[PDB]
Amino acid sequence: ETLVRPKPLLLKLLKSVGAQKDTYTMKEVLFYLGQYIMTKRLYDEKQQHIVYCSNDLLGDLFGVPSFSVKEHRKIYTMIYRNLVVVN
């Protein structure tokens, strides 16, 4: 319910899936990141909980080649490294 402010490059990713504002709830950020993953088919076909994000903007932002969608705490870490103070 509190608002977060994405850094420019995370904001660019969000806007690529139709987001139109500067600040978001965490639930909204997750929804759009999810949309990005699914519409770009970044998940592995055999192990569908694994997202392969090397050579993609998402991998650039998160600083990892891959991650599991089951690892929610690590997902929050990676999102938080891409936020700035809300002014």
Ligand SMILES: COc1nc(N(C)C)ncc1-n1nc2c(c1C(C)C)[C@H](c1ccc(C#N)cc1)N(c1cc(Cl)c[nH]c1=O)C2=O
């Ligand atoms: C490959 O992934 C999936 N594949 C399938 N297939 C049918 C193949 N179905 C569901 C998922 N899936 N599971 C979860 C999520 C998805 C989609 C929306 C990416 C989201 C989610 C994961 C990562 C980010 C980031 N960056 C943002 C949202 N997510 C969540 C992650 C967190 Cl932290 C909180 N709540 C969530 O639902 C999950 O558990």
